Structure 1
Amino acid sequence: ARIAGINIPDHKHAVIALTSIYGVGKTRSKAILAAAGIAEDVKISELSEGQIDTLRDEVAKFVVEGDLRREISMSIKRLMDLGCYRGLRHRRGLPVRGQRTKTNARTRKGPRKP
């Protein structure tokens, strides 16, 4: 079922299938389901079309899609050409939040090099 995230969730429980939307996690999806008066156990199937329709405008109250990717990128690109310390970290590909770089920074520097 297409939702405001125009991606398509599937035949799982409602509170979990909503998580397939970028920008909606676990608690936020619970809040969405609560405002529409839908139990968290019902699957995405066996939902009346009006129920889906009232779901998808509740999601509209959050900035959650490739638009959210837009501001995420802009916030990083801002730091980038601004030139602050985190700009240098982001441009060099090194950890940004003051972690340890002498060893053990693999998830940020990528796989091992010789």
Structure 2
Amino acid sequence: SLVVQEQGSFQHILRLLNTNVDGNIKIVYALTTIKGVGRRYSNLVCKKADVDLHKRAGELTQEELERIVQIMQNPTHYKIPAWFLNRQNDITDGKDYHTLANNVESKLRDDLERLKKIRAHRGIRHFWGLRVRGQHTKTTGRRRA
């Protein structure tokens, strides 16, 4: 029914959160390239930003994607129910975070460093590089490295 002439503003690449998001796919699946946001979360932000989810990533207006990234970086202030965030009730701050792109990688290294610094069992298992969730290791993960 609805055929639409796309115009010359279109982008094959776009940059949000320091990552080269590819165009030419639907916006919710496209933003999952950015670390710290997966398919569930990505749907909710674009829902809370009141954007047409049917659009491709490369054709969306300049104000809309900056509106999107604000809702990602201040989630619970814009009525996200906050058990939906990944790093809620944090160990020092007490408040619900949601690390994005580099925070996810950097903050994951840091809480590892506590368990290594207090010599907790899980930390010592990470320092050896072995499993930490209680798996059997007599056969599996044999050629891990």
Quickly name the TM-score band, shorter chain normalised. Answer: 0.7 to 0.9
Structure 1 runs not aligned, ≥5 long: none
The aligned residue for residue 51 of structure 2 is 38
| Higher-strand-fraction structure | 2
Q: Following TM superposition, by how much is the alpha carbon of 1:13 offset from its aligned partner in structure 2, in angstroms? A: 0.6
The aligned residue for residue 8 of structure 2 is none
TM-score by length of 2: 0.68
For 2:57 and 2:108, how far apart are their aligned partners in 1? 29
Query: Which residue type is aligned with residue 133 of structure 2?
Result: R
Q: Following TM superposition, by how much is the alpha carbon of 1:54 offset from its aligned partner in structure 2, in angstroms? A: 1.0
Structure 2 runs not aligned, ≥5 long: 1-13, 75-97
Tell me the C-alpha RMSD between the 2 structures: 1.5
Larger relative contact order (C-alpha < 8 A, sep ≥ 6)?
1
The aligned residue for residue 10 of structure 1 is 22
Aligned partner (choices 129, 135, 140) of residue 93 of structure 1: 129
TM-score by length of 1: 0.85
Query: Kindly, what percent of the aligned residue pairs are identical?
Result: 28
* Aligned 8 A contact 1:2 1:8 in 2: yes
Equivalences, count: 108
| Higher-helix-fraction structure | 1
